[PDB]
Design a protein around this ligand. Sequence first.
Ligand code: ACO
Ligand code: ACO
Ligand code: ACO
Ligand code: K
Ligand code: K
Ligand code: K
Lengths: 489, 489, 489, 7, 7, 7, 7
Amino acid sequence: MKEIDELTIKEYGVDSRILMERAGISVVLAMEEELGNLSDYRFLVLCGGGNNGGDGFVVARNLLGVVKDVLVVFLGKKKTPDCEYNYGLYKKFGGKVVEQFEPSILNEFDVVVDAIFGTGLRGEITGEYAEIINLVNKSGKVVVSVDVPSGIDSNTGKVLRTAVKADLTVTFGVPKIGHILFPGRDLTGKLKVANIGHPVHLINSINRYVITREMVRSLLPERPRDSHKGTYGKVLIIAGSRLYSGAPVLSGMGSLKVGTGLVKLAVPFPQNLIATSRFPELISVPIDTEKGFFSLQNLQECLELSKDVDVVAIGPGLGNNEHVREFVNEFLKTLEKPAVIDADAINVLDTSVLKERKSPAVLTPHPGEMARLVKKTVGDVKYNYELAEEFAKENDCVLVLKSATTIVTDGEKTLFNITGNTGLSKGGSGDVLTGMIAGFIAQGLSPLEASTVSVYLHGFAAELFEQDERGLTASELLRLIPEAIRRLK
Amino acid sequence: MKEIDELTIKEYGVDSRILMERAGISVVLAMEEELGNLSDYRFLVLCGGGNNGGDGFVVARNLLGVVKDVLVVFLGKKKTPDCEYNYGLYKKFGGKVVEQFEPSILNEFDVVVDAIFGTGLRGEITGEYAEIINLVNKSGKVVVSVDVPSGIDSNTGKVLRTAVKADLTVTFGVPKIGHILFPGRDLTGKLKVANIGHPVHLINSINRYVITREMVRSLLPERPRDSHKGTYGKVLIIAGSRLYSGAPVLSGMGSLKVGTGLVKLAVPFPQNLIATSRFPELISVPIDTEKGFFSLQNLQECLELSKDVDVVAIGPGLGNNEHVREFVNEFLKTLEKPAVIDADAINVLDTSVLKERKSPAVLTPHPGEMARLVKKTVGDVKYNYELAEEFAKENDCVLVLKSATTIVTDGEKTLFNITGNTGLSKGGSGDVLTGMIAGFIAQGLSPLEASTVSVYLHGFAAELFEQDERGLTASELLRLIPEAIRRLK
Amino acid sequence: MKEIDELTIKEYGVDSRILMERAGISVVLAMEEELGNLSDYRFLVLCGGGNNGGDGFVVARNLLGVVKDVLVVFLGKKKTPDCEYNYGLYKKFGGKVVEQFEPSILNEFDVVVDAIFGTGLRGEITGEYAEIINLVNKSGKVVVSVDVPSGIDSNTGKVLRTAVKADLTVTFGVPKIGHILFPGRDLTGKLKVANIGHPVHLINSINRYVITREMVRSLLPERPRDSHKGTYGKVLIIAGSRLYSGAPVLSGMGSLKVGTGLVKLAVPFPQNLIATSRFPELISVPIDTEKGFFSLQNLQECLELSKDVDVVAIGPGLGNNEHVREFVNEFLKTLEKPAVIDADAINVLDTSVLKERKSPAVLTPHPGEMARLVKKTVGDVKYNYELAEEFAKENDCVLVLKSATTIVTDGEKTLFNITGNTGLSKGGSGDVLTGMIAGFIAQGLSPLEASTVSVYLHGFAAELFEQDERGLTASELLRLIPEAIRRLK
Amino acid sequence: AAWLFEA
Amino acid sequence: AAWLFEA
Amino acid sequence: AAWLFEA
Amino acid sequence: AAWLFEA
Ligand SMILES: CC(=O)SCCNC(=O)CCNC(=O)[C@@H](O)C(C)(C)COP(=O)(O)OP(=O)(O)OC[C@@H]1O[C@@H](n2cnc3c(N)ncnc32)[C@@H](O)[C@H]1OP(=O)(O)O
Ligand SMILES: CC(=O)SCCNC(=O)CCNC(=O)[C@@H](O)C(C)(C)COP(=O)(O)OP(=O)(O)OC[C@@H]1O[C@@H](n2cnc3c(N)ncnc32)[C@@H](O)[C@H]1OP(=O)(O)O
Ligand SMILES: CC(=O)SCCNC(=O)CCNC(=O)[C@@H](O)C(C)(C)COP(=O)(O)OP(=O)(O)OC[C@@H]1O[C@@H](n2cnc3c(N)ncnc32)[C@@H](O)[C@H]1OP(=O)(O)O
Ligand SMILES: [K+]
Ligand SMILES: [K+]
Ligand SMILES: [K+]
């Protein structure tokens, strides 16, 4: 957006002062929307010396004479041209500015407007900026952040030593990555994205997107009335082991609940019988194994089973020994169908196999699995969307990096999912998502589309759980999937 | 509280007559709250010669001139100073006292105020006191007891030959143990605890507590939005046998329904398959046994499984033969994780093993199991909170002694749980509670906190059952757990 | 009540400290009833050195440990014994007392408890007491007064230089005259009367009463089903003049709307025709006058008309010249029926005539008319209930001294009416009340009973007006009378 | 309703 | 709601 | 309700 | 509903 401001000014000819005025008045309108009538409140506006502080001066000036009290604390050492202009107007309109932050000043205000740093923050916040931000966070006042809560890196969502915790953040043009990834997402509080007059062409030129209800609605496949099961695709799920007998059941039903026509599981005998005892609409094929895990002896049978389906999901509950590794990699090298690759299939995956596949693939790792897959630490891969993009591009796949905010990327387009809650932090949740993705692929969606729709719906289903989210289990999540679809429509 | 009265008078300087007046007026206000306007009722006030009867005189005097009729029957042989004072005031205000109880007197009154004995009761009630109390219990009148229903031992809840059955009991300062344990809890009817002016410091100095909604709300762990399953802990449940295949399933789901991230069961094959057929989100590891029960041959595998979890629960459905005994005791001696020890693991437990463990433990016996564990009779251990405290302190554990009122103690703090109903008197209920406790421990609560939260929620879930409590089963109790959590919040 | 406290202590034997404790806890309960849960509020308790301040110390001590903050400012120079006792307890319980009032202290509290002066106030408040009270009144905090707002004379309702304006006043035993008469009534805010343990006999020994809904309900006459108009009495109203043609109509309908059987007006022709044109159920007898006013030439006809009625009302709209004076006084001297004497009949009345009458009378002056009648200033008669009592006793009549609080007295019993609103401060209101009184007398109520019932209902009718009270007129007040009666029942 | 308070 | 009584 | 518009 | 703000 740094470039979006610049082009809007330099190429389109919009005066910088117009953009800044529209930014500030958007903050005022957003506050009124959340607080109701502003006239009874006393506002403390904390302004830096940059253009964020300039926006702050616009806010402060526009409250003059309309609210109970306004005071600006100016915290910088110099002012950008637009910040100087708007500081000048604020004073001309009768506004009061002080240049020293006094801890007890918080006592006489109701709302703190945080206009210290925006997207121009570079490096750790220290010194008096940090003390001030810490005092605001202990104050219990209503906090409104201009653009991004000060102290959040707008490109990553990381906290730069300390950061403002906002009740309301008003940002301009588009959401920033730091509003979307944690910890930034948490500090942002309620986010409003204000149109401040950038041309819509520049706003739509962005390559990274938040997944919205309207996007998912447009991607849901059509259900022609004169259809039959084959119209809606066929999925094979290769899953399970003597150790992990439940995984296949959750994945299979995941495919059925999103509207797939036929789902077949291949599961080691007698663990295959667990599936049909719970959901008799599944086909659960018994696979004869030596010790309860897939091995190369099952290669030919799984390839045979794959011939009559549209997509294959592999991984959930397979186990991770050497015989599983041999099977997984030889199967994926030979399989000429789209594959959705999860869990233990990721843990044993030879990424050379992905490069050589002619057919597409979706991988669905959590950060632990992604760490192992690229031989990095969890902290280096977590919310690392640039790494995810590089991986997807190099390996010709779609990568779905699961976390509270899920990243979906094919290396050219990256989408962020923010639906869901902590009920999904529990075994079995990922197994469901794997089946949803395979099911949407079988229904005709591209691997990226299927992933986009599935992460959104899987999170939205969790949110529809009636009781406390901590009690949500994967079996309840399945029941909620058709409600999420209905509501989406 | 005997000492609380004394200190409030002797150290703080509150006149004894002030405490007694506040006690009596609290009874009047409490009656009005339950009966509405008192002016149409006729009151019979039964007063002993102690300070309880003194409180009774205050009640009687304060109703003079405001209700239809008041009569005091004075049943003692002498009066304490404060009882004499208030008897004197009652007569000065025009009140009528008789010293003989006539069976037909009950006919002309609507409410009986029981102020015969309070916490000063010592020994069995006999003679004319007993006849009188028996007549009140057959009368069908509304009964209000002052402090404790007369005939209940306020330290134990036991009936001292006979006791008043109250509709409403008004007690002062804090609930007494006799209001909380049965049979006293049943005879108390509706309990109100009145503030009569003891300083809050003395009221908070008490070491035994009733578990309240507000206490449990403050202990529920936080669900950070940027979490993953590991954030919420991992539990291993060692449970089941060829005889008892259902126990592991109830315990595991007990952990999941309270928000635990991962639950694994170790169960003898093929009984392990029962779990995933019902709840495929569980991991149910097959354990190879010679005859369907755990033995020393399974020691190493269970220790291996324990390495990657936070807490281990053991006992439900294990069976109780010599090979199970060897396994249980050697496993607990070697296990360096918190353990929740229930059911058959308690039945074979060598308590020397608990002393030598460096890691913590929670034991969850019913009175039959506690009796066997300390080699006493059920009647000697039932509601014996002093014994429970001694056991917990000596063995460095938390003891959860289950009954209609559950006692939870670490030997320093003791908490009483009064949630629940008779639907929990049915097989499978305890298995659920075991999993809840392990789950909360895995989530970061201390063994005492986890026990406190779990007993309350397990009882509260039972109360949320829609139909007759006698039809409640453990499977329905599981479904209700997330509703109880939601309501608690 | 000074004597009520004393007798309760000295004759009945209730310790003074018990009365004071009950007083303070009543204030706490009353605050909770109005504020809800007290735990979030910060209390400033202003205590004098008398027993009112002693009550304040009880309040403060009972909030210790239960609310956010409590502070006592002690404003006296010495303490009564009970105030010293309770100051001592407050400090023993950990309470903070300061002896200097700092203007900014008001800033950190939510509720001010005014326990500076009660019924022991003598003389104008000055000095630092006055500054303090003025600061409390400018503070905008919630004000709770103990007993009476400090600065009000509890015997008269007058302000002693300055006084606290309370949101809530909690008084003990009985309301005080200063809560009932203005300006005190206005400063009292919401009044609660707390039972603090005085014997009901002493509380009922009071000779001055507030007129309540229950008293009026008990006095309303019965309507036997087998009745006829004569059952409900007959009223003659002698009223009106060429100048004041409306008065008779309002008075007559006033009698009919309260259930009187027959109402006849005697009004100078042709002003008598105004009545029946509006309300044809009235009998409006034309009286031939020389110049439009009653005179001695009409004496015999009015005496004739009086023979067949039960009560005569005279005065409204008569005019006040010498010929009216002669007529009024000769008519009342000769009339052997109860008389209700209002307005111009009071303005020309010879009070010697009242002494000599064998039949009863009710006089209904406003303070201007009462001033003229006893040859005093309005300020000397206004709310002067002792003067009203002396007048009633000396003249053998019932006096109804109208104002926002109306005083009704026969010289032995005095009743205060507090129903009504400012809509009654408008011409025609008094004319209605005159007819109501005569009507109730005709129905069989004694002059005092009829006055008591009428003032209450007349004020209650005003309060039932649907729109803004300032728009109420006497004609609307008439329509509302039967609704007030229905609601009373 | 009225043991303690008259309104 | 709770100065006098705990439920 | 009224920072931007009077009705 | 959405000229100025996306939610
Ligand atoms: C181009 C215009 O004028 S349009 C502005 C009005 N419209 C909008 O704001 C929409 C644009 N949204 C945006 O993200 C940005 O334009 C803004 C306005 C919110 C931020 O603009 P910028 O001035 O680039 O950045 P911002 O106000 O965050 O911060 C500027 C820097 O903050 C301070 N700063 C940055 N990092 C630190 C740190 N670690 N410690 C202390 N101070 C710091 C200043 O030093 C200043 O840089 P400097 O070192 O050269 O003085
Ligand atoms: C310290 C004060 O004055 S404050 C009192 C007002 N406030 C309160 O009550 C709050 C305090 N709550 C309390 O538990 C107690 O203070 C009270 C007031 C309810 C009870 O006080 P006490 O006088 O200790 O006990 P209580 O009234 O129960 O009984 C006294 C005993 O009952 C009788 N009693 C006890 N057991 C028996 C029995 N088995 N058979 C017959 N009579 C018995 C009396 O004999 C008398 O003892 P005595 O043998 O010396 O005469
Ligand atoms: C008898 C008992 O102890 S029971 C008390 C508890 N119960 C109740 O309060 C119910 C009783 N209700 C009552 O009206 C009274 O008993 C009370 C308690 C509210 C007031 O009691 P009292 O001590 O008589 O009066 P109060 O507290 O109003 O005031 C006492 C006087 O206020 C001060 N005072 C009075 N007038 C003025 C003035 N004009 N300027 C400055 N100070 C004044 C003090 O001087 C003190 O008299 P002092 O000059 O001898 O020192
Ligand atoms: K900011
Ligand atoms: K009792
Ligand atoms: K006062």
